[PDB]
Amino acid sequence: MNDLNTFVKDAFGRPYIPGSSLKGALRTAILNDLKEDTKENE
RNA sequence: ACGAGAACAUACGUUCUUUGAACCAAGCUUCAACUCC
């Protein structure tokens, strides 16, 4: 009935949000033009 | 009964002296620990 998923923590065991997460969020927000933006978008 | 007989082209002597396989150059670029029920 219980299966816990915990938050990401650094080596000191004190949590933080990595910057790749926020860049993924802003990339999802910016890319509301057409889905043509590949892995060499400047 | 030879323009012949006898006679080492031999002795000595460092392929050696000086000389950076160097100079320049981000293991980096783009990525949501995630979706479904």
Q: Answer whether any strand B atom is within 7 A of the Cβ of A18.
A: yes
In the Cβ-directed half-sphere of A40, how many Cα atoms lie within 13 Å?
Answer: 0
CA distance A31 to A24: 10
Reduce the DSSP state of residue A19 to 3 states and report it. helix
Task: Note the CA–C1' distance, A42 to B1, in angstroms.
Answer: 115
- Which amino acid type is present at position A22? L
Method of elucidation: cryo-EM
Residue A4 · residue A12 · CB < 8 Å: no
Q: How far is the CA of A25 from the C1' of B17 (A)?
A: 72
